[PDB]
Amino acid sequence: KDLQGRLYINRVFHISAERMFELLFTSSHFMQRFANSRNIIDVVSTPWTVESGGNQLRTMTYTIVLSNPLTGKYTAATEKQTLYKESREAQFYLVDSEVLTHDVPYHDYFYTLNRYCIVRSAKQRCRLRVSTDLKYRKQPWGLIKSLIEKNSWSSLESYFKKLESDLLMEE
């Protein structure tokens, strides 16, 4: 069930699956601190809502303060998060997060699909797996694809390394 693009986190935490979900997918103190650390500002979120089909939905908007000047100073972003009912019936959590940016060069060419899988382990532990696909909306001819990929893979590498490290402090 991993996405084939890249596997960024695959780690067993001394955190229960439900508390993992709470830390990452609610307006938790953890995500307030993490947002500050990552220079993510002006966060607006919904709660989780429940669809007739049983999946749950959550959306967010926020601004990213960017570090590479060629990507701009800031970009607005929108996220759509889906929690799959089938995963919950199987006693785990599978969330697909789709992330779109609005201001970076070539913003209209791509979006990011991040898949978060939280599986129960003995003794109030869980395994968190996070994998990512870069998805194209327009054909990224030539240097376009090279620049999108180089910038994205490096930024996400940093982001998820810090997420894993900061989650360890919540054990």
Ligand X SMILES: O=C1[C@H](CC[C@H](O)c2ccc(F)cc2)[C@@H](c2ccc(O)cc2)N1c1ccc(F)cc1
State the residues that interact with ligand X by CB under 6 A: 31, 34-35, 38, 40, 43, 60, 62, 64, 77, 79, 99, 101, 112, 114, 155-156, 159
Q: Considering the complex, state which of residue 46 and residue 124 has its C-beta at the smaller distance from ligand X.
A: 46
Nearer to ligand X, 39 or 124 (CB): 39
Q: How far is the CB of 37 from ligand X (least distance, A)?
A: 9
* Binding residues with Cl ion: total (CB under 5 A): 1
Alpha carbon distance 111, 72 (integer Å): 17
CA angle centred on 154, ends 151 and 160, rounded to 5°: 130
DSSP string, 84-122: -HHHHHTTSEEEEEEEEESSSTTGGGEEEEEEEEEEEET
Q: How far is the CB of 40 from ligand X (least distance, A)?
A: 5
Picked from ligand X, Cl ion, none, the partner binding residue 91 (CB below 5 to 8 A depending on kind) is Cl ion
The DSSP letter of residue 148 is: H
